[PDB]
């Protein structure tokens, strides 16, 4: 017999990403900064490294879309689903999609793109949802109002259980 084995984690530490398109809500620089910071959350505590590609295929393809946007997991307009991401693997694996019917911001207004992206990239790297309400990988979005972000211990233990520490 055969089962469907899951790729639990990337077999390589050096990963690429590409920002395929951009939300209207934030400047290009703001979007790039948010994603850069979101990846840094994970690379700061693991041997993982992330390199941005401007063209072609990257491991983590990032895009904004609304409604049905090419994977038959359609978005739902304002609120509800905010974004989703695929677990590690080839093709769609690792990819992250953000609902552009949300208002994305670099602040408390709407949904903070950095916060949501950091969470989604957790999925791209092989993390499922945490039961700890204080974790980044908790299923519900909140905003602390703080200027600095520190990755909760639960998320650190989770990602390090896959990739080891930095």
Ligand X SMILES: Cc1ccc(CSc2nc3c(c(=O)[nH]2)CCC3)cc1
Of 51 and 122, the one with the shorter C-beta distance to ligand X is 122
Nearest residue to 86 (alpha-carbon basis) of 57, 44, 47, 128: 128
Residue nearest to Zn ion (CB): 147
CB distance 53 to 59 below 8 Å: no
Q: Which of 95, 100, 120, 155 binds Ca ion (CB under 5 A)?
A: 95
Alpha-carbon span 26 to 41, nearest angstrom: 21
25 binds Ca ion (CB under 5 A): no
Q: Is 91 annotated as a binding residue?
A: yes
Return all residues near 99 (Cβ < 8 A) that are at least 6 apart: 64, 65, 66, 75, 76, 81, 82, 83
Of 14 and 144, the one with the shorter C-beta distance to ligand X is 144
Q: Is 55 annotated as a binding residue?
A: no
Q: Which residue ranges make up the site for ligand X (CB under 6 A)?
A: 73, 82, 84, 86-87, 92, 115-116, 119, 123, 136, 138-144, 152
Q: Is 148 annotated as a binding residue?
A: no
Tell me the window of 25-33, 48-56, 69-77, 100-108 that interacts with Zn ion (CB under 5 A). 69-77
CA atoms within 13 A of residue 123's CA, in its CB half-sphere: 19
Return all residues near 24 (Cβ < 8 A) that are at least 6 apart: 100
Q: Is the dihedral of CA 137, 73, 126, 47 positive or negative?
A: negative
CB of 2 to Zn ion, least distance (A): 28
Specify whether 120 is catalytic.
yes
Give catalytic residue positions: 120
| Residues in the annotated binding site for Ca(2+) | 25, 59, 76-77, 79, 81, 91, 93, 95, 99-100, 102
What residue ranges bind Zn ion (CB under 5 A)?
A: 71, 97, 147-148
């Amino acid at each position: 017999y055969n089962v469907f084995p899951r790729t639990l984690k990337w077999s390589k530490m050096n990963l690429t990403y590409r920002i395929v398109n951009y939300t209207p809500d934030m400047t290009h620089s703001e979007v790039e900064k948010a994603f850069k910071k979101a990846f840094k959350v994970w690379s700061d505590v693991t041997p993982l490294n992330f390199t941005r590609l401007h063209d072609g295929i990257a491991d983590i393809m990032i895009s904004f879309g609304i409604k049905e946007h090419g994977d038959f997991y359609p978005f739902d307009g304002p609120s509800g689903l905010l974004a989703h991401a695929f677990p590690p693997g080839p093709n769609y694996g690792g990819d992250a999609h953000f609902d552009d019917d949300e208002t994305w911001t670099s602040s408390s207004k709407g949904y903070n793109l950095f916060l949501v992206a950091a969470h989604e990239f957790g999925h791209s790297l092989g993390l499922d949802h945490s039961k700890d309400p204080g974790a980044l990988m908790f299923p519900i979005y909140t905003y602390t109002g703080k200027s600095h972000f520190m990755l909760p211990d639960d998320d650190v233990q989770g990602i390090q259980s896959l990739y080891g520490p930095g």
